[PDB]
Amino acid sequence: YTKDLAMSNMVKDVDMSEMVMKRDDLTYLDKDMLVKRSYK
Amino acid sequence: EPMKNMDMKSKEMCILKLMNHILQPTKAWVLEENEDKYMKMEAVKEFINTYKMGMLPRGEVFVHMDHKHVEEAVKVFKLLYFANDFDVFLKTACWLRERINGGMFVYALTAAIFHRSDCSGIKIPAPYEIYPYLFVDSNILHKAFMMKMSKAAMDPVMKNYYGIKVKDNSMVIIDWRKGLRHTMSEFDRTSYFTEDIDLNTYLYYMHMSYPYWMNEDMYRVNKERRGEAMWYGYQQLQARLRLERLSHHMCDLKPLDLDGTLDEGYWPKILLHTGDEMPVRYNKMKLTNENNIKYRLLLEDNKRLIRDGIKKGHMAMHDGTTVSLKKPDDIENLCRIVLGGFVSKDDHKGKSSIWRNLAKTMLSYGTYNMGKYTYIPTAADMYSTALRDPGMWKMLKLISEYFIMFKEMLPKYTREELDFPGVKIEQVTTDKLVTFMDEYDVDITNAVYLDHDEMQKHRSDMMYVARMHRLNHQPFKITIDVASDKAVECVVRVFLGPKLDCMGRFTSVNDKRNDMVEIDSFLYKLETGKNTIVRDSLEMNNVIKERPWSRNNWAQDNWWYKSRIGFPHRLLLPMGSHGGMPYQMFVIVTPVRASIDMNTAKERKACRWTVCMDTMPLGFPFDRPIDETNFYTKNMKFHDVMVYTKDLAMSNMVKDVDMSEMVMKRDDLTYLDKDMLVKRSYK
Amino acid sequence: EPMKNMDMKSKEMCILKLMNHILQPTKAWVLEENEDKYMKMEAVKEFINTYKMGMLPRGEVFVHMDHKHVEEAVKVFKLLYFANDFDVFLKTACWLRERINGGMFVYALTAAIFHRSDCSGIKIPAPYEIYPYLFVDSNILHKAFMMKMSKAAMDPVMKNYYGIKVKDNSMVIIDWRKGLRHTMSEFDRTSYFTEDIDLNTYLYYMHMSYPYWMNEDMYRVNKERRGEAMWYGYQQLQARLRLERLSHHMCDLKPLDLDGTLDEGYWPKILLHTGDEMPVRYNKMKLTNENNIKYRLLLEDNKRLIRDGIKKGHMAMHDGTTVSLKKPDDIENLCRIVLGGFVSKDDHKGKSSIWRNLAKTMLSYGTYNMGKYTYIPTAADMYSTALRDPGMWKMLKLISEYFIMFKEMLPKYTREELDFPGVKIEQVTTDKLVTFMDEYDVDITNAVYLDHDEMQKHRSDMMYVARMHRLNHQPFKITIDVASDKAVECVVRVFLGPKLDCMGRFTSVNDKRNDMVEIDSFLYKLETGKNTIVRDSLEMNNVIKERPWSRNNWAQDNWWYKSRIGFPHRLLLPMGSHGGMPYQMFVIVTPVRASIDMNTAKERKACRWTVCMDTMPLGFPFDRPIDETNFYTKNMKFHDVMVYTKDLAMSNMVKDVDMSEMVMKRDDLTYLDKDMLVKRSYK
Amino acid sequence: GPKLDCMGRFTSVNDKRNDMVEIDSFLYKLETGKNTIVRDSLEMNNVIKERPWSRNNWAQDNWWYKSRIGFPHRLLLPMGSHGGMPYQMFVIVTPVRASIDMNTAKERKACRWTVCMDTMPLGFPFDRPIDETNFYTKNMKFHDVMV
Amino acid sequence: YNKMKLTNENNIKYRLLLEDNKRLIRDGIKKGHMAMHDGTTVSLKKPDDIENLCRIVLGGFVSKDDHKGKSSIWRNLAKTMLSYGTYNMGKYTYIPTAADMYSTALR
Numbered sequence A: 001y002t003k004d005l006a007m008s009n010m011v012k013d014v015d016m017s018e019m020v021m022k023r024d025d026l027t028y029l030d031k032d033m034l035v036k037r038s039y040k
Numbered sequence B, C: 001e002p003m004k005n006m007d008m009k010s011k012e013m014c015i016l017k018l019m020n021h022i023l024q025p026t027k028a029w030v031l032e033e034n035e036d037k038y039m040k041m042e043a044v045k046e047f048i049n050t051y052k053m054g055m056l057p058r059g060e061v062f063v064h065m066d067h068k069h070v071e072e073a074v075k076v077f078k079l080l081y082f083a084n085d086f087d088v089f090l091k092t093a094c095w096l097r098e099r100i101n102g103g104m105f106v107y108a109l110t111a112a113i114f115h116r117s118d119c120s121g122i123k124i125p126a127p128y129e130i131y132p133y134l135f136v137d138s139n140i141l142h143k144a145f146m147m148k149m150s151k152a153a154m155d156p157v158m159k160n161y162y163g164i165k166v167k168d169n170s171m172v173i174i175d176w177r178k179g180l181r182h183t184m185s186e187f188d189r190t191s192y193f194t195e196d197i198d199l200n201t202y203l204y205y206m207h208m209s210y211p212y213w214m215n216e217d218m219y220r221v222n223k224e225r226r227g228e229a230m231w232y233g234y235q236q237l238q239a240r241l242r243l244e245r246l247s248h249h250m251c252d253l254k255p256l257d258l259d260g261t262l263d264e265g266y267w268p269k270i271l272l273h274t275g276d277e278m279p280v281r282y283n284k285m286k287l288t289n290e291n292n293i294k295y296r297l298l299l300e301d302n303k304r305l306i307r308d309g310i311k312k313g314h315m316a317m318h319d320g321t322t323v324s325l326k327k328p329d330d331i332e333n334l335c336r337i338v339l340g341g342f343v344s345k346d347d348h349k350g351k352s353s354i355w356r357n358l359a360k361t362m363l364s365y366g367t368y369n370m371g372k373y374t375y376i377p378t379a380a381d382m383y384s385t386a387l388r389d390p391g392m393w394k395m396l397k398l399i400s401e402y403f404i405m406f407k408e409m410l411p412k413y414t415r416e417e418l419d420f421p422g423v424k425i426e427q428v429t430t431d432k433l434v435t436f437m438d439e440y441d442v443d444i445t446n447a448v449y450l451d452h453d454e455m456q457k458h459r460s461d462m463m464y465v466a467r468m469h470r471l472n473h474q475p476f477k478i479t480i481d482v483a484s485d486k487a488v489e490c491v492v493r494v495f496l497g498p499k500l501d502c503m504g505r506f507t508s509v510n511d512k513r514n515d516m517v518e519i520d521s522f523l524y525k526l527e528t529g530k531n532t533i534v535r536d537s538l539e540m541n542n543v544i545k546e547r548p549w550s551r552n553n554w555a556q557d558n559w560w561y562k563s564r565i566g567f568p569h570r571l572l573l574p575m576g577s578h579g580g581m582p583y584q585m586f587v588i589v590t591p592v593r594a595s596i597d598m599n600t601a602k603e604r605k606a607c608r609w610t611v612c613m614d615t616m617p618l619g620f621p622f623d624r625p626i627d628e629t630n631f632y633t634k635n636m637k638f639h640d641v642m643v644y645t646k647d648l649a650m651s652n653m654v655k656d657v658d659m660s661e662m663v664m665k666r667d668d669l670t671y672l673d674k675d676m677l678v679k680r681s682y683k
Numbered sequence D: 001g002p003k004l005d006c007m008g009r010f011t012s013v014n015d016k017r018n019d020m021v022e023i024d025s026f027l028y029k030l031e032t033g034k035n036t037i038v039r040d041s042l043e044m045n046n047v048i049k050e051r052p053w054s055r056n057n058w059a060q061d062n063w064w065y066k067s068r069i070g071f072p073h074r075l076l077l078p079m080g081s082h083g084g085m086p087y088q089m090f091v092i093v094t095p096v097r098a099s100i101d102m103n104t105a106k107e108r109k110a111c112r113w114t115v116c117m118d119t120m121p122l123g124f125p126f127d128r129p130i131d132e133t134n135f136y137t138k139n140m141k142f143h144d145v146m147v
Numbered sequence E: 001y002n003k004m005k006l007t008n009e010n011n012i013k014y015r016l017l018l019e020d021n022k023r024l025i026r027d028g029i030k031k032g033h034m035a036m037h038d039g040t041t042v043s044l045k046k047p048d049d050i051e052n053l054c055r056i057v058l059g060g061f062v063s064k065d066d067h068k069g070k071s072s073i074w075r076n077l078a079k080t081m082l083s084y085g086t087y088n089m090g091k092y093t094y095i096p097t098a099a100d101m102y103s104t105a106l107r
């Protein structure tokens, strides 16, 4: 088996279906780099 | 004789009789002396002359994409269509049944039933029931023939190895498992989807609904959104295949390069009633060669005519008319130009600017025998087998470039069009999505030949059944919470699409839009405040259950039209993973908006997607390039989901034993056949 | 049960029983408790262990060129061969018949009968009678299955179109005509020769006579000229195909380029009892690809080892022995190295320097399923279908380079060797040489499956016959006038060869020598003065008539061994032309000249060509480059001849009517089917 | 035209139409009843003998224009076979039918094929795809021959 | 590297687009006029029309005031025939080649 510890420790009750990566070339192994779409 | 017609049930009985044991068809109603019984004299005279000159023998195979064969089939269809009333139609059909080729007769009769106004409320058997040869693997039919010849005298060892059994001394059941002995490339890993009987039947009924050779004003289908519907069907099929391939960690298909080679070969495994099988194509075949250069040129002529026109905003037609390609609503015309159905001037006759039935020549074994009664078809030669060949999928990918270019030339959707003021989606939730493989029985009794005693009883003393293994999914619910300031009618669309690419990247909306599958669409009435919309998978639009056996009189009153335009439930969701394959669902609610008449589509019960609901382009809001600034309104919502798969083979066989040393009964079986594992024995 | 053996007729009856309806095989003689009944304990123990571990299922296909399959077949053959006496052999064969795969059992039993000393004087049915699947086109077998299922209830129209009839309500006759619907290239124009059942049977019996896996000193065949005989058989087959192609104005075949593409595709038209057909290969296929690179390397390893050795005059073997390749008589060793049969050291075991069963991989559809019980064979995978594929002929042409090089390294024949002092040929004359196509009945009853009642009677209530159309020639005589000073025994050889190339040039002897077919060879006694030798075509060496039906007990006392090494009479002469195709006959008379023992060959009745007559190299005097100064002695003679062809279709149908407007019943028929022309009718 | 293809198949009219060579074309006057038209190879339209030597002053008075548009007699028929190569001849008789002026062609003696005879398209009746139902009228005939 | 095949499976799409431009231009030059997507016909018969031709090929052609969107001729397509791949095109992380910049194209 394989597990993802990126969100195992970041246990918060929020949905991330709309979040985006900090850099667009990151993969599923970098879920800790997801940042919610902000407005400058 | 043509069974008499009293009511719709009698009509169904007559049609079923006409479709029974077509291989062995067996008058007082003279055809030449009943010319007045038809609306058009020219059609009947032409058919009589052609028949007197000779037609396709019943001992040959009818090819869907052969110009001569389609010409004869169109003559037969014209003869059937212009019958004054249903009695004349039945008598003409009975006359044809025992005179012309069985396949051509079935094709023409199905087209007439689809397009005759007085044939409403009539159910017909599935195409694989009528002619199993084009849907069932050759080895299964060979085993059925062996059982018929031996009258179920096969020894126990052979039956156990092949999985053949006899139930109640009245049914013969032959287990059907794909295996890997015909493997040619990794593409075959999705064989459970491409070779599914229901998918091929869906394409066949798509062709029947909007034939390319029906391009006259008289036909009612000319007043429907035929071209856009056909194009959207092809696009949705491509998107569904994309999702299925992603389930197996495979990248999207690439357009075929006619100047290069086709890497993916294919093994048809199709037997024809003449005794010949569809030829196998080896891997790494060069598409263009000396034997087809002519046809290649013709294909090019089409492409240049289409693409250039899209770039220039108009096309000049051979009949002398100019067709505009600037406005979005012109899409329909474009489709009719590409997929057929374009109506030229009334006095115009002959071939149009765009020629048809040319792509298959790039995948064929040769052009020597083309246009002959003895031509052996390939997979691409039939609408019922085209989707089995990866080359056809690559050809569809190449063709999609026309529509992609046309939509890119259009302006992007504005925020006003995408927005529903006063309406927002609060949240979207779904139950667990689970898939699994299960058995389904296919009646292949029409494949075998009957003796005199069986012929007299119009039935085989023993039924022959193929026990296929097919995908399926558990029921699930979709719950949507919507806040509305006013009470208003709305259209709700629900799509399913990818979450990651084959490289694991987080896909953006622009690279996702072409892979979104419109899994549901329905009308609703919003009221002031909060509204909870609950949609069950059973009630999703144009999704039908497994087709029932026709011999049992189709053991609902709306099945007659649902079966014609329905998509199988079994293929609603892509195969998941034991740990959960991520996908993304999209929900959008919009107002109801707004020569083509929607009443014609409503009356014929041909309401595919939202053609009978609103007037927005099919594929909205994903059919055009997306500007991120004008997108993501409050009336649309994304929701991540996970699709799981389970193995029921050992879920029921719960015994405390280890199987690390067990072996398959046949060495070519896959992980989906764990129920065939047998511990290594010693003889 | 194993039928008892009393005399050779009883032996034939037992063997025929063992070969009957192999598809449906149906003890008290325990195998494990009768180990002492065999000469070798190791073989029986190995077979028992392998059988307990499992073998090829009866529901799969046995492949001749599959390493696992051949290993199991060799184990079975060893079990059968070392039986002490004929009773034990029969009991073991009966035990195997109902336990192992039918094809493997037939292969092993045929090999044992060919190589068992106590099996002399036993006739066996032709391979196409036992297993018609590998020799009869798929469509014919499909029609036979249809008739069996319907018990001859086919409607008149279908029977007339297919040419099927029922004679005496006891026989079913299906007309068999090749046609052109499977055409892939111009090579198929010689299909009547390459696809002839007798040619494939001849190759199969060539393989059985000298198996490549029989390489032990104990076997008697090790004392015969096996390698040279096999090589000369291949060379003569190539020369015969060359003549046949010249009859159609086609040039000689070129060696296949493994670094390039194979232009000529092929359509097998072969059905297997599992329900799958041999795959079709498209034209313009690249031989070497990523999926077979491994095997390619292995093939190269053989070539380098052989050619280099021929250049260096010796070869070093893995067992530690050096084989000389300098003297002419070393040819035999070379052949055993290339075609198998080389005997290594007694204690040596395992693979030798040269690996076998590798060429087929260059023509296969893939290597994914190799070495498995479910592998679907190609045409090149079977000795009974190899000659049908032009790729195999090109491979043979490539392989012939080894022997051509070896013979070129040898000194040329001297005038003393080529001369017969005191003997000269006065003249040579022949009767008119004429060829024509005629019908032949093939029993395919073993292809269908029997019901319980039929099984009890050990016979099908109806016989099924395929009426094939095959080449044939009229009888002719050869007259030779010879002047001799003394009375002496002599050997006379008669060859047939080309007169012109495909470009019309007058061919020289050096470019003709490899295309000469040794059509006759016999002993004679010359006396003082003039001698007139008259040879009838009926008595030409090792030329046999059409094989009789086995069900009728082979309706001569020497047929048992003639059938094993005989070449069909029907293919004695190449097809001519209506105006006369020119060829050249060659006659040479030489003295009788002179570890290998000729008595072993004489006792086993395996006297192919002149192996039992003299000791000169096979192919003499054309197997080496010819020096024009030392050639053309008075004891050799050339004679130009013309071969005509006639059409008997209309010779008997003598009616005063013109047929310029008639059409064929089926549009794919050729000029050889003028009896199928029907005047255009009006229905 | 051809009778068989290179594979020995009996060729149909559609696959033969592009291989038909118009070996002769001429005007005639039919009368009531039966008419026997006899055409010698020497008089076939625009077929000329071997060109004579110019040094000998061309050892007919119409050769000047015949030589300009003439096809050699030597190549009138394809090489046959010693046993006889099968071919098919086709004969059709039609009425005379009907900016381009035929008088210009007549005056310059450039009357190739039937340009100076009728106005039907060159290649008729084989220049278009053939519908078997509308073909094979009583005014056309096929005849097998051996060369 | 040397000896690179320009057209491959990963750029076939773009290749087609390039062809669309060529056919539109050359044919027009042969026919003396070009029909534009905005609904205007541009003459290509007189010498002074060269300017228009250049604006069609090298950009700068002015369409109708109300017209918007892409024109008949698409731009920035040649580079795809020399690139290492199209996987990352249209992304902020795309690594350019020499042909991707006006300041390095001539190299």
Ligand SMILES: N[C@@H](Cc1c[nH]c2ccccc12)C(=O)O
Residues within 6 Å of the ligand: B233, B236, B237, B240, B517, B518, B519, B520, B521, B541, B542, B543, B567, B572, B607, B608, B609
């Ligand atoms: N949504 C389609 C049916 C459908 C579901 N999934 C599909 C996949 C491909 C094509 C069609 C479909 C309809 O209403 O008609």
Ligand SMILES: N[C@@H](Cc1c[nH]c2ccccc12)C(=O)O
Residues within 6 Å of the ligand: C233, C236, C237, C240, C517, C518, C519, C520, C521, C541, C542, C543, C567, C572, C607, C608, C609
């Ligand atoms: N002459 C051969 C038989 C034979 C005749 N024609 C042939 C052609 C090919 C191979 C063998 C033959 C023999 O005596 O055995």
Ligand SMILES: N[C@@H](Cc1c[nH]c2ccccc12)C(=O)O
Residues within 6 Å of the ligand: D021, D022, D023, D024, D025, D045, D046, D047, D071, D076, D111, D112, D113
């Ligand atoms: N019939 C042609 C002459 C001709 C005969 N055979 C030909 C072959 C090729 C070209 C021309 C011809 C004419 O009248 O002018």
Ligand SMILES: [Cu+2]
Residues within 6 Å of the ligand: B189, B248
């Ligand atoms: Cu997978």
Ligand SMILES: [Cu+2]
Residues within 6 Å of the ligand: B318, B319, B348, B349, B350, B351, B352
């Ligand atoms: Cu037109």
Ligand SMILES: [Cu+2]
Residues within 6 Å of the ligand: B020, B021, B026, B455, B457, B458, B459
């Ligand atoms: Cu019936």
Ligand SMILES: [Cu+2]
Residues within 6 Å of the ligand: B473, B537, B538, B543, B568, B569, B570, B572
């Ligand atoms: Cu469902």
Ligand SMILES: [Cu+2]
Residues within 6 Å of the ligand: C189, C248
């Ligand atoms: Cu020939």
Ligand SMILES: [Cu+2]
Residues within 6 Å of the ligand: C318, C319, C348, C349, C350, C351, C352
């Ligand atoms: Cu060794």
Ligand SMILES: [Cu+2]
Residues within 6 Å of the ligand: C020, C021, C026, C455, C457, C458, C459
């Ligand atoms: Cu029996």
Ligand SMILES: [Cu+2]
Residues within 6 Å of the ligand: C473, C537, C538, C543, C568, C569, C570, C572
């Ligand atoms: Cu003979």
Ligand SMILES: [Cu+2]
Residues within 6 Å of the ligand: D041, D042, D047, D072, D073, D074, D076
């Ligand atoms: Cu002449």
Ligand SMILES: [Cu+2]
Residues within 6 Å of the ligand: E037, E038, E067, E068, E069, E070, E071
């Ligand atoms: Cu525009």
Ligand code: NA
Residues within 6 Å of the ligand: B282, B283, B284, B285, B286, C282, C283, C284, C285, C286
């Ligand atoms: Na190929």
Ligand code: NA
Residues within 6 Å of the ligand: E001, E002, E003, E004, E005
């Ligand atoms: Na490179």
